Write a protein that binds this DNA or RNA. Structure first.
Ligand SMILES: Nc1ncnc2c1ncn2[C@@H]1O[C@H](COP(=O)(O)OP(=O)(O)NP(=O)(O)O)[C@@H](O)[C@H]1O
Lengths: 560, 578, 117, 117
DNA sequence: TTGCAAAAGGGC
DNA sequence: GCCCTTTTGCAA
């Protein structure tokens, strides 16, 4: 608890105050040192600040010629630590430069920067203790403070914890290069949240088939295996179009009791049970396209409910669906005119077609518009996966149950984009409707975010803009800050940045967040796997390096 | 009443004149200090200027080696407070840089900058007291040798502050603002989200309502944060503020959830709130306004471009004449019914000489029989009535309101001239048609305002949110309003959160500014480019995220920028209540 | 031709007013346009204007365009930026004026009261 | 996946090759592209490259782009600019060998003759 | 025979 | 990407 060095200068460098530090030969010989990027405490006028070590250089002190002295000593071949202490004692100095980030006030709130410049004579620098660092971070470990790979610059007892107040309701960003720990960090956060706070729902837009089962030695285990290890039962809902294959995999990996941990559902519905759903999907498809859906489609969409009571109109609609290509189950009857056909058979279908209005006839004539729906049709399902997901996430019965929803987007094929957009729009509309009665209280995991947050009119863009009001969070990973719009980057509240190689990425990051200007050099120069620079608002508005943990070790530690 | 230091230099740097200041060890040991951005008084040759600390750095004075002296003192654990006074005095110094902004001449007049560079020997720098600070804040530019205007009453807006630094607040120093600055002049309110924008907007609106009771307001409430206190804080809304101020019958809330909003208003205001807020529907009844329905259907094509159908064109042009022919009004109503709009219970339609109640299924079928067993375009409209399908979202029986016309009557009514109504539109209730309705309403309001030129001015203020969305289009009605509203007495007050997106023309031509913390460099750069006086606070804005801290600058006769701690709406209401 | 707020009418390079500004000297037609923002006026028109009467401007872009159009205003750009004085004007009448002269333009009242003698 | 003249392929709508480059790691799908000029490859793909094998580059923009995309390549830009030697390559491999090393690549005939035994 | 809707290929 | 053309089919 003694000052490390002596302050010998200070100034207002741009928007940040700074001051220079000097390490005397006695301290240098004792073994004291300062690591670049280290956090130190600065005392000035009875107020403690938080400073970061920025730069270090060697500069002569007093009237001396270090070059000549050292060169002459080397020439004469005199050991400089045992023969000439009086010559080694006048060249062993070293300078440091420190920047004041701000001071903590009241209930942990961070007062930024400072308008007051401290005089040299009365400014001291003390090394920060573990208790002080723990207080700084705090006001189920996610990662412990570490300064690079330097031994002695790691503090396993200083950790950052997971709290729904940090994630739910706020947007998080997760950058980094390919293969550095973004997915591992996402899974760590999700597992810790699902184990600590079971009233937080999730929606994982899986795009690589990695968040449920993962066995290959190229990524951390899957959420299913993590839940099995941690003993979390009946909380995962899997939506996929490969029910049998995924059941085989779950049986072969999770064991014979896999049905407790994972519940598998299909992404197929029978449209002969939800003609309104079919018409709504067809109408929404074009609106998500350019614009201006046709008048006949608008009329059908608005008036199918009234049409439901007229068997002739409904027969026209069912005929249109059958003509589009969708296969009905065995034994279907259609009441046209005064007759009951069986469209499941060739002759009955032909007779009905030969036999065949307020708007149904135009739909029947233009039946090719429903062809795309064959990517979802499966006779005998009657599920309405969209509605089921809506109840799973925003259901009124929950009031806190915990529900992890994973969608196997790859199984769909070329309909995944449209399906995702439609589902997100439905969920956001329901959440807006529910405002004032209950909060959604769930998180939207999004990977490869640059595909979704491009257009300003997108539903994902609107969600990113307006989700905090209704309690809808977000957590997106993109591998490159340059691919996200500045409009979103500025408004993002949390950051988790891994190694970045391109100068454009670091420039964009520092442009979006000013405090990220002090770590650009570290990011550019150090390709370390699992090293993260976290920045959380508003309690911790400064960059703190961390050492993210492996999912296997997190599981093994949480078991006890 | 004594100098804070000794001036040791001066020069003209760029367009401004600066002088260096040095603080001696004795003063540094008495606690005397200067905060960046502080205002100080400079007395040079019998004249008084206004300074502003701009920088601070340490530099040796005389012949001394501070680094070696301090290192040697430290290694021997010598305490440089009560052990080595000579060593402390030889090195205890500190430099500051000050910029002259002008002088207060005559009776409150302000003379910007200076043409005389002050000599070092005769220059003295003093600290400025509260009375001097107030009189400085109360000064503004004037032509020449002219007495002050002595204008209307003024209301407190905030008090001077220099950030979160202790001793940097002057609660007794309050910037007084005349609300007339906000009338007919476009204002900008930048800053991050949740940093006091809503509070300052509410304060401005309350000041206008209390001062000018003859000015209306069109509040495009996107966030539903202006009528009642949100279920996230305790700050009162506009309705509660008006109730406290005792202003009656000046609010008109247009929404589509009238039941819920009336419930909320009752629970927050009492039972007599009907004396304050008139809740009105946002849903139209097209069975009373076939002209409106036809206009919408016809103009949809044009807004999408391409030549509209001839039958729609002639129907839109001749519906007024057709209203005198029941044999054609029957065709129009049948077309609407086929489109699908649900009619009110008991509607009677007279075809030929028969009376039909189209609200009944069998009667509708009989009317269909009679109509199917060429009177202008009525038959064509009945045939193609599927075009009116999209209107089912806007339709609700038994409304007879036509809010698009009610708003125009409220805002530009000759019989309503005086005590402008505060129209508040609850946008989130309109789903995906909110932008369409907003654009249509703004266009039809601007057309009426331009038409009324000469007879009377519009005299109302438009409140906008997310202005970067609407001001991006150079051909947009909102851009046209921003350009030309002052001519017809139409103001504006837009909060963007990102200045860079707003066009440079709009930024340059804006009269008032209220800037809060900005996170991006581009926004600060564009702000400095747009306005010169904002060149000194860029660093503070960039790297000081303080809630409630605003830099105000009101054109055109304001000398410099002022950092303020805007007052809260509760305290403003209490002050006005007296 | 006395034109007020000329940035609205001189913006379009095909408009009749742009045509007049560019080609009126041949038919003995003058012009006198007030804009308050030199940034908007086309550089083609700016480079070809003979007389100038510049008052306080509060945009570095406006001052930049003015300096680019006319070199002599480089000695007064700084005062133009920093000094908002009322009735204070810098005048430069091409082509035979040595430098830029600051003036306190006489009041119309005084001009009238002197023109009768 | 080996593809010469990769500047042609690394550009398209919907980016099949962008997807391959940015997501082939998980499935063991590696790329090895020769472009002959760093300035012709998009940064979005350059920043995702782990290995490098750079021969002499004459232009200055090429070396500047290379340094911008990979930091440690700033210590050999002068050598690349000034020394046009055939077969001299600077090899960089993350994360096992995160620094630039010069090499003298072997002729294929010599490799075959040495490996025949 | 004409007018209008709705889908798909051409030019720039 | 954006903007016109040609064609078919169902009114009338
Ligand atoms: N904190 C860590 N400690 C040790 N190994 C780690 C850590 N984080 C990640 N890894 C390993 O790094 C490799 C990549 O893991 P992964 O989380 O998939 O990175 P990634 O960012 O998701 N790849 P990508 O999706 O392309 O960006 C795996 O072999 C992990 O085991």
């Amino acid at each position: 608890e003694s000052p490390i060095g002596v302050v010998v200068s200070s100034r207002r460098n741009g928007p940040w105050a700074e001051l220079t530090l000097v390490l005397t030969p006695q301290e240098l010989d004792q073994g004291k040192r300062l690591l670049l990027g280290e956090l130190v405490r600065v005392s000035s006028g009875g107020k403690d600040y938080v400073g970061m070590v920025l730069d270090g250089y060697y500069e002569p002190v007093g009237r001396s010629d270090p070059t000549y002295t050292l060169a002459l000593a080397h020439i004469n071949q005199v050991d400089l630590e045992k023969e000439d202490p009086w010559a080694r004692k006048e060249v062993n100095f070293y300078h440091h430069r420190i920047v004041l980030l701000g001071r903590v006030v009241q209930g942990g709130l961070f007062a930024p920067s400072t308008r007051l410049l401290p005089p040299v004579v009365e400014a001291r620098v003390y090394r920060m203790t573990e208790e002080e660092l723990q207080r700084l971070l705090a006001a189920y470990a996610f990662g412990h403070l570490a300064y690079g790979l330097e031994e002695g610059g790691e503090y396993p007892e200083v950790v950052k914890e997971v709290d729904p107040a940090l994630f739910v309701g706020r947007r998080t960003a997760n950058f980094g290069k390919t293969g550095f720990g973004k997915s591992n960090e996402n899974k760590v956060i999700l597992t810790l949240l699902a184990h600590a706070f079971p009233r937080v729902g999730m929606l994982i837009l899986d795009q690589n088939a990695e968040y449920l089962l993962q066995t290959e030695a190229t990524t951390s285990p899957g959420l299913a295996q993590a839940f099995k290890a941690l003993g979390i039962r009946g909380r995962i809902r899997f939506y996929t179009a490969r029910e049998e294959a995924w059941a085989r995999r779950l049986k072969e990996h999770l064991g014979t009791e896999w049905r407790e941990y994972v519940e598998v559902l299909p992404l197929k519905v029978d449209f002969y049970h939800f003609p309104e759903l079919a018409v709504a999907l067809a109408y929404q498809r074009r609106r998500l396209q350019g614009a201006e859906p046709p008048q006949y489609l608008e009329n059908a969409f608005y008036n199918l409910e009234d049409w439901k009571h007229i068997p002739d109109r409904m027969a026209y609609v069912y005929g249109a669906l059958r003509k589009a290509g969708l296969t009905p189950r065995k034994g279907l009857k259609i009441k046209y005119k005064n007759e009951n056909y069986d469209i499941s058979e060739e002759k009955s279908w032909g007779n009905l077609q030969e036999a065949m209005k307020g708007g149904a006839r135009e739909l029947y004539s233009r039946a090719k518009v429903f062809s795309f729906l064959r990517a979802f049709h499966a006779p005998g399902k009657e599920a309405n996966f969209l509605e089921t997901i809506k109840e799973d996430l925003l259901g009124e019965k929950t009031e806190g149950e915990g529900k992890v929803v994973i969608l196997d987007l790859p199984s769909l094929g070329e309909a995944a984009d449209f399906f995702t957009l439609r589902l997100m729009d439905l969920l956001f509309d329901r959440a807006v409707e529910l405002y004032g009665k209950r909060q959604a209280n769930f998180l939207v995991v999004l990977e490869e975010a640059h595909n979704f947050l491009e257009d300003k009119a997108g539903i994902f863009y609107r969600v990113a803009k307006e989700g905090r009001k209704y309690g809808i969070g977000m957590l997106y990973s993109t591998q490159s800050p340059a691919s996200i719009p500045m409009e979103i980057l500025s408004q993002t509240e949390n950051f988790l940045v891994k190694h970045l190689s391109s100068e454009e990425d670091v420039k964009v990051l520092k442009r979006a967040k000013a405090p990220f200007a002090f770590v650009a050099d570290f990011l550019l120069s150090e390709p370390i796997i699992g090293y993260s620079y976290v920045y959380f608002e508003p309690y911790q508005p400064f960059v703190v390096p961390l050492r993210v943990k492996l999912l296997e070790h997190v599981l093994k530690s949480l078991d006890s």
